């Protein structure tokens, strides 16, 4: 189970946050700030997985924007890297050569892309065409 998904930049400011566990807002901001400082206090050769409170944090840099996921101690970390890559590919297939600016100005559309891919911390749509196709029909549905 993916507990939460965080997106942030090189400046540490958050770009997207989806939480599949229930915990209050002060603990939310504290956990997010310390996790952002843990990821940003690491180099580019540092194995892409950190250990944090019996949850392995799977992160992967793509641009100035970072991508991060937190899973339990039963999941696959490399398949969580593939889950991050599939979410980046779904952002590619929706927006079309996606940059950070599309995430910043369409955070709600990136949220819809995450909801068409992951609900409850688990994958609902494995494939790439079905999720983007469902977002396209919900976009012309209005």
């Amino acid at each position: 189970m993916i507990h939460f998904i965080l997106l942030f930049s090189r400046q540490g400011k958050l770009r997207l946050q989806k939480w599949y566990i229930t915990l209050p807002d002060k603990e939310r901001k504290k956990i997010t700030r310390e996790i952002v400082q843990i990821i940003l206090s690491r180099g580019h050769r540092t194995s892409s997985f950190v250990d944090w409170k019996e949850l392995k944090l799977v992160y992967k840099r793509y641009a100035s924007l970072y991508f991060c996921c937190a899973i339990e101690n039963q999941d696959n970390e490399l398949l969580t890297l593939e889950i991050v890559h599939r979410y980046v590919e779904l952002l590619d297939k929706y927006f079309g050569n996606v940059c950070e600016l599309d995430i910043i100005f369409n955070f709600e559309k990136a949220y819809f892309i995450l909801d068409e891919f992951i609900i409850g911390g688990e994958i609902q749509e494995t494939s790439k065409k079905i999720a983007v196709k469902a977002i396209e029909d919900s976009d012309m549905l209005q």
Binding site: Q74, E77, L79, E82, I119, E122, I123
Partner: protein
């Protein structure tokens, strides 16, 4: 009302956090004033701007009812932004979230499958224990539908309902009948996640769900010999999430059952050999395959194949694959204990690696790989790793040294030497709840007390800045001063222990402000316990008890007042209540 893109641009044109907060509050004022006038047209964009506000980290508690109003409307874009706002704002402890159970239940019987999947997404993402009770039958009626788009979301809703309220788990039994016979892989993936959720939750249906083990084997079989597809394919291999989830389900069944492992063993050998290892995706499939193989009771010949695949995972130059190999060898330690020990030189080679996570799982794997054969041989390397580390690792290193030397001590003298070494070298990084275990093992060491008491005395005589070291040492000195000193009732030949400077250094840790006010209580109880066991010095323990009877520490003052009362009035009774105790287990 301004648009969401204009608000995002206005946020990005800010120069500092304070001016950003002023323009946040200036937009939130107009949003709340538009909320007060009950405007139906711009409520969608106002709730979306408030969602951007809440993402930046600003209060949005006044938009929860407007999220409910956006859910309760008839427009799909309003429903979309309202369900996203429910997911982002409400949770289980927000208590406004109970007011949309009827709205989710109305949207689950909508004619539009995107409205239905929106409600399924919101319920499966953040439904509470109260929402999951009166919506579980609504979820289960969508688990029997022919729509795959609603079917996968209803299966993950059933996952969320089972995870939240686990006593509504038996009512999803006939919804999973012939659910693995569906052809589309998202529905198959969510069905496999549902089956492993009930199999991990309850063990009464493990043999009930073990009859679809050859069905899972056949699905993995045509998944592997599905050569190329333009869908469900990344980096040349087909359905990796489905393959990893199917192998995780095959790990969950058959861990204690034999015949499912014989039905699963051939395709475990086929997946473990005929899939590529040049990519991260195939490495993920091979890691889940080797976790399945070393968790089930598999064939011992291909257990050696699992050894070889973990070896070529270990000497992979990629740090992700080295982390994966360390985590898998930590996952299987209790089984094939002979077959983990040959990688110990590689494990202590990555113990000195620069990566934090690599050296952390290498430390935990070395601690799990400590046994009773060459415990000294790993113990010099573990004390080297303790003495030569960046100091975030020292608490976990000292704790693992404590359980390793507790579990696999060949002798008590070596155990006392290594616990003195880790107490003197680690020091302040020693966790304070290990001090009862250290005192318990020292009191269980009945045949030698004088050597460990003398070593603790010599360690404090160097320095006493280390609070668990002085907490062990004060208790040991106060309990065993009667053999710390020996035959020293009068003046004699000059020996290094002469029954005064022990009480002087106990006085020193009492007076010093570099104590944590628990070791002062340990030192005061030590000084009181030394009054029975010392027959040479008199009227010094009494005055050092007497000057501590007016302390600002209330426990220290209560202890010294009771000990001063015993000294003044009941001095003949102190040997009856200050004697040694028998040991405990």
């Amino acid at each position: 009302p301004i648009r969401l893109r204009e608000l995002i641009r206005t946020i990005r044109t800010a120069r500092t956090q304070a001016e950003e907060r002023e323009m946040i509050q200036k937009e939130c004022a107009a949003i709340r004033s538009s909320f007060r006038e009950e405007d139906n047209t711009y409520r969608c964009r106002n709730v979306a701007k408030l969602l951007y506000m809440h993402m930046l980290g600003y209060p949005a508690h006044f938009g929860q009812l407007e999220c409910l109003k956006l859910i309760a409307s008839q427009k799909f874009t309003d429903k979309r932004i309202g369900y996203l706002g429910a997911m982002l704002l409400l949770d289980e402890r927000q208590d406004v979230h109970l007011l949309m159970t009827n709205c989710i239940k109305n949207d689950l019987n909508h004619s539009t499958q995107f409205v239905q999947g929106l409600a399924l997404c919101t319920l499966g993402c953040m439904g509470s224990s109260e929402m999951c009770r009166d919506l579980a039958g609504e979820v289960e009626k969508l688990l029997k539908t022919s729509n795959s788009y609603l079917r996968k979301k209803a299966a993950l809703c059933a996952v969320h309902v089972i995870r939240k309220v686990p006593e509504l788990m038996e009512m999803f039994l006939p919804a999973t009948k012939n659910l693995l016979n569906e052809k589309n892989h998202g529905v198959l993936h969510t069905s496999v996640v549902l089956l492993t959720e009930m199999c991990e939750r309850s063990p009464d249906m493990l043999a009930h769900f073990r009859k679809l083990v050859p069905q899972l084997v056949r699905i993995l079989k045509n998944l592997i010999m599905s050569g190329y597809s333009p869908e469900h394919d990344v980096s040349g291999i087909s359905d990796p999430f489905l393959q990893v989830r199917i192998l995780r389900l095959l790990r969950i069944l058959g861990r204690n059952d034999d015949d499912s492992s014989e039905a699963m063993n051939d395709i475990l050998a086929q997946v473990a050999t005929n899939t590529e290892t040049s990519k991260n995706v195939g490495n993920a499939i091979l890691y889940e395959t080797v976790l399945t193989i070393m968790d089930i009771k598999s064939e011992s010949g291909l257990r050696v194949l699992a050894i070889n695949i973990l070896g070529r995972f270990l000497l992979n130059n990629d740090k992700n694959i080295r982390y994966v190999a360390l985590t898998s060898l930590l996952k299987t330690v209790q089984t094939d204990h002979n077959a983990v020990q040959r990688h110990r030189s590689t494990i202590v080679d990555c113990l000195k690696d620069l990566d934090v996570s690599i050296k952390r799982r290498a430390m935990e794997l070395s601690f799990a790989l400590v046994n009773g054969n060459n415990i000294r041989g790993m113990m010099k390397e573990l004390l080297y790793f303790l003495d030569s580390c960046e100091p975030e690792f020292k608490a976990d290193c000292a704790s693992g040294i404590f359980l390793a030397a507790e579990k696999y001590a060949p002798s008590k003298r070596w155990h006392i030497d290594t616990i003195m070494r880790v107490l003197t070298t680690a020091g302040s990084y020693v966790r304070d709840d290990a001090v009862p275990n250290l005192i318990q093992l020292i009191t269980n060491s009945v045949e030698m007390h004088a050597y460990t008491v003398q070593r603790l005395y010599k360690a404090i005589l160097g320095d006493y800045s280390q609070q668990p070291l002085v907490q062990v040492a004060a208790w040991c000195i106060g309990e065993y001063g009667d053999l710390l000193v020996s035959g020293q009732c009068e003046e004699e030949e000059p020996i290094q222990v002469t029954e005064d400077e022990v009480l002087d250094i106990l006085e020193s840790v009492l007076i010093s402000n570099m104590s944590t006010s628990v070791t002062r209580g340990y030192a005061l109880t030590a000084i009181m316990k030394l009054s029975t066991r010392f027959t040479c010095t008199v009227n010094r323990i009494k005055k050092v008890v007497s000057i501590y009877g007016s302390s600002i520490d209330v426990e220290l003052q209560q202890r010294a007042v009771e000990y001063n009362a015993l000294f003044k009035k009941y001095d003949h009774m102190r040997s009856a209540l200050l004697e040694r105790m028998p040991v405990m287990e």
